[PDB]
Design a protein around this ligand. Structure first.
Ligand SMILES: OC[C@H]1O[C@H](O[C@H]2[C@H](O)[C@@H](O)[C@@H](O[C@H]3[C@H](O)[C@@H](O)[C@@H](O[C@H]4[C@H](O)[C@@H](O)[C@@H](O)O[C@@H]4CO)O[C@@H]3CO)O[C@@H]2CO)[C@H](O)[C@@H](O)[C@@H]1O
Ligand code: ADP
Ligand code: MG
Length: 670
């Protein structure tokens, strides 16, 4: 638990935490209340984790964008400033920390990105992004470079991506429309394409991160960088004469940075809430409190009117607010984290050359929007006492006549297939996902349910199972894409997981000590299993034959995984792609004890993993916990797409296992 009678504070490592610690010392000196300031890594991810338990800091600092999520999860206390105190802060800063009509944090300062330039290398910085390549060539001839900035965090790249029309959520009326996302529109593609072109032309390096960019600029090696107010003090102590100015325009339009309000929230589980308020209102949010923090790392444009007025003629702060005015305040809705995770992955994938700009943003768009989503769950009622069900719009309602009362259990699916609806109709939901794989976005297709429910019929029917149809579709699409300069190779692996052991179902290695280790490349997001044999697929018919034979050999008590790797190269654009389609026929889920124990653990872990992924909020994803999830790690996370068929029997006698299956389903569908 949290210690009553103390304050523990968490703030990010890039802010002036030593200055903040000074404030805590004054608070301790006056009140006897000890204040401890900490800057743990990934604290914005740890907070929701520990605070869910009733642990964590009394006070948490972060930009306002994260706080809506915390509030929706009940992790924050409503703050209670009176009107005399509210009047001391700008109204627009109070707006940033209001969620569902309630104030959920104290606003501290307004932050936006600006262009920072070396006045000696570059007396007249470029007004446009478009000039940068030529400027870089000139500087390179003096052993310098034009621009270096953090490319790992979408916060830094977004202003360019937004310039020509990109946006997170359409703003119409009160509400941000979580169904209208602007991540893959023409504006966003244009911006990201420009960024990627800079990298292709060697004006920037895909690997550049915060530390690299900072050392480069502060050492006088690059002429420009892009950063926020917190970075100024390190430049002050450097030898560089720098200026802070408006970001470059793109296609004549201003870059639009996301505007953040550094905010301080109170842990709902703190037994120190009144003390936290005294500290925040009477010590931090004062001229002297803010100056202590500001002198450590600059805050930007502070929320406190008196001190803001005092610093207003600082040209760096003026530049900050000009860029701010041109950008947009960040939404604080829980969905923002989904947005950020999605865009982070897209940018990294495009910038590194692993995926085209279009394909990267397409996948991020889907992950970030409340539409079809990344994880799709379907119920398939096998064709056939038959249970009494209705499938209204989609909802499954099962009615039991429990001697002698009427029970109605309800379950919500993306779609429900039932009597005689063919494999060809079901495959229409998987069909468009094939193009995703060809574009390098990974895909998993699971069939789940009790033995007899129809998993293998769905996945492996020799004419129209999901496997044969997927192979058929892949080859059709590959042929069409030749017209656009693409050539692809198709490789398959067929493996089985039984009681946690991997068996190559194609080439069963003979050495008894032969190991099948799952080995990830967390850089490229690739995975191989040591010693599993791969076949080069020349036709669907060929692969289907091999798989038919490989089967000629228990299946109901193990996972069967068919892994198709798609590798493309385009001779016209010189681009590359690597995508994986995983087709999984799961072990039966029905309730030999070793088998049973292992299956339950595996299936339960699968559900744990999918559920967390669906929260898209950064909760822990325990891939290690099973060979299945560990194997499929890089086709489950990121902007990967998953399809889950929950197969069920229509027989009254199977009602209990059907209900178990259906309950698993609602867990993974969120
Ligand atoms: O697993 C991947 C990574 O996940 C973690 O980072 C996430 C955050 O959890 C998300 O909250 C989000 O971050 C946003 C952030 O919310 C937003 O306020 C802004 O961050 C600025 C910040 O306002 C500013 O004050 C200053 O500190 O710089 C920040 C940017 O670095 O923008 C963020 C997005 O870039 O998204 C990220 C993922 O992109 C985790 O921390 C990472 O370690 C992890 O790699
Ligand atoms: N939707 C369906 N329509 C008609 N027959 C089916 C359907 N699903 C399964 N079957 C039949 O039921 C039997 C058992 O199905 P199967 O796919 O083996 O279940 P599981 O793999 O889940 O144990 C198979 O012989 C199959 O032909
Ligand atoms: Mg089967």
């Amino acid at each position: 638990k949290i210690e009553e009678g103390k304050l523990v504070i968490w703030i990010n490592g890039d802010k002036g935490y030593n200055g903040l610690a000074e404030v805590g010392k004054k608070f301790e000196k006056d009140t006897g209340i000890k204040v401890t300031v900490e800057h743990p890594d990934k604290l914005e991810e740890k907070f929701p984790q520990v605070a869910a338990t009733g642990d964590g800091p009394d006070i948490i600092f972060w930009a306002h964008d994260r706080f809506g999520g915390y509030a929706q999860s009940g992790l924050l206390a409503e703050i209670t400033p009176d009107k005399a105190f509210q009047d001391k802060l700008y109204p627009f800063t109070w707006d940033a920390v209001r969620y569902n009509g309630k104030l959920i944090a104290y606003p501290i300062a307004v932050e936006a990105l600006s262009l920072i330039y070396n006045k000696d290398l570059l007396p007249n910085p470029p007004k446009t992004w478009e000039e940068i390549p030529a400027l870089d060539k000139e500087l390179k001839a003096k052993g310098k470079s034009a621009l270096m900035f953090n490319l790992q965090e979408p916060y830094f790249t977004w202003p360019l991506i937004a310039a020509d029309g990109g946006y997170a959520f359409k703003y119409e009326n009160g509400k941000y429309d979580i169904k209208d996302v602007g991540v893959d529109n023409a504006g966003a593609k244009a911006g990201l394409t420009f960024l990627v072109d800079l990298i292709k032309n060697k004006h920037m390096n895909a690997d550049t991160d915060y530390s690299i960019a900072e050392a480069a600029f502060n050492k006088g090696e690059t002429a420009m960088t892009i950063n926020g107010p917190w970075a100024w003090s390190n430049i002050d102590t450097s030898k560089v004469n720098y200026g802070v100015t408006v970001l470059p325009t793109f296609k004549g339009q201003p870059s639009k940075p996301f505007v953040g309000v550094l905010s301080a929230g109170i842990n709902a589980a703190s037994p120190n809430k009144e003390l936290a308020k005294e500290f925040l209102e009477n010590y931090l949010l004062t001229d002297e409190g803010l100056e202590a923090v500001n002198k450590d790392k600059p805050l930007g444009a502070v929320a406190l009117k008196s001190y803001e007025e005092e610093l207003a003629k600082d040209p760096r702060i003026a530049a900050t607010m000009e860029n701010a005015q041109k950008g947009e305040i960040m939404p604080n809705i829980p969905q923002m984290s989904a947005f950020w995770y999605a865009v982070r992955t897209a940018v990294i994938n495009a910038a590194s050359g692993r995926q085209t700009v279009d394909a990267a943003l397409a996948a991020a768009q889907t992950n970030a929007a409340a539409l079809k989503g990344n994880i799709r769950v379907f119920c398939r009622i096998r064709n056939v006492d038959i249970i009494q069900y209705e499938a209204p719009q989609q909802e499954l309602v099962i009615t039991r006549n429990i001697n002698n009362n009427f029970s109605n259990l309800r379950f919500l699916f993306d779609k429900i297939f039932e009597r005689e609806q063919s494999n060809d109709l079901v495959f229409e939901e998987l069909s468009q996902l094939i193009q995703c794989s060809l574009d390098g976005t990974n895909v998993c297709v699971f069939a789940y349910g009790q033995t007899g429910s129809g998993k293998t019929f769905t996945m492996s029917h020799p004419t129209n199972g999901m496997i044969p149809l997927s192979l058929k579709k892949i080859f059709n699409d590959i042929e069409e894409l030749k017209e656009k300069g693409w050539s692809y190779t198709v490789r398959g692996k067929f493996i089985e997981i039984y009681n946690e052991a991997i068996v190559d179902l194609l080439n069963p290695k003979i050495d008894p000590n032969t190991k099948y280790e799952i080995k990830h490349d967390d850089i490229a997001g690739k995975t191989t299993v040591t010693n599993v044999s791969t076949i080069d697929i020349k036709s669907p018919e060929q692969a289907i034959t091999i798989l038919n034979q490989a089967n000629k050999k228990h299946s109901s008590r193990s996972h069967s995984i068919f892994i198709i790797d798609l590798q493309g190269y385009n001779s016209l654009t010189k681009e590359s792609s690597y995508g994986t389609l995983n087709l999984i026929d799961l072990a039966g889920s029905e309730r030999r004890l070793k088998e049973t124990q292992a299956i339950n653990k595996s299936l339960s872990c699968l559900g744990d993993v999918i559920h967390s992924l669906n929260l898209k909020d950064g909760s822990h994803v325990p891939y290690r916990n099973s060979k299945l999830t560990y194997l499929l790690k890089h086709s489950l996370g990121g902007n990967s797409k998953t399809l889950m068929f929950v197969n069920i029997s229509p027989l009254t006698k199977d009602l209990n296992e059907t209900i178990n299956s259906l309950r698993f389903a609602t867990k993974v569908n969120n």
